[PDB]
Amino acid sequence: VLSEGEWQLVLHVWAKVEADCAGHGQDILIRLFKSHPETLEKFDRSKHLKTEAEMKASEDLKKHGCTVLTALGAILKKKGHHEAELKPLAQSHATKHKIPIKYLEFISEAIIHVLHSRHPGDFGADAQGAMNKALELFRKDIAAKYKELGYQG
Ligand code: HEM
């Protein structure tokens, strides 16, 4: 459903993200927690971090942020053909972590904010629109997998 051109814009900016996995990952989570503090409660250890500096200095948050981006990167490189990649992720996020689709919207917003902040020249209107569609596709498909597992989140 995304055009080839749009996928290229997505993967163009993603190569930039990959130049600093920990950094982008960290800032996305920090942004998420700031914009939607209720999300922080999902994180057993990061829950207890009281300042921005503490979060910035957290190897936990760096490694988890990078883990999120690494999994998302693999999904986006499938260019929509991500049925296999979504299976274990829907399982864990539906039944174990219990992350509502709204929370995936929240983190999608965080991703777009961080990418625009760090890469404005490589993330203008068309690039943002393409990333928006890619993440919308992600959320739609993972929502369907949620329901197959009995989770109406
Ligand atoms: C782009 C969307 C997301 C991606 C690609 C993603 C990816 C991952 C990956 C790869 C893992 C490790 C393996 C696993 O348990 O599945 C993970 C774990 C986890 N995810 Fe996500 N995630 C996303 C969104 C979220 C959001 C928005 C939340 C909470 C608001 C969340 C909560 C968690 C938690 C609590 C863990 C386990 C952390 C731990 O116990 O160490 N995820 N995620």
What structural domains and CATH numbers belong to the chain?
1-153 (1.10.490.10)
Best mutation site among 14, 89, 96 for ligand 1 pocket (most ligand atoms within 8 Å of CB): 89
Contact 82, 139 (CB under 8 A): no
Phi, psi of 78 (to 5 degrees): -75, -15
Question: What's the reported resolution, in angstroms, to a tenth?
Answer: 1.8
**Helix, strand, coil distribution of the chain in percent, nearest 5:** 80, 0, 20
CA of 99 to the centre of ligand 1 (A): 8
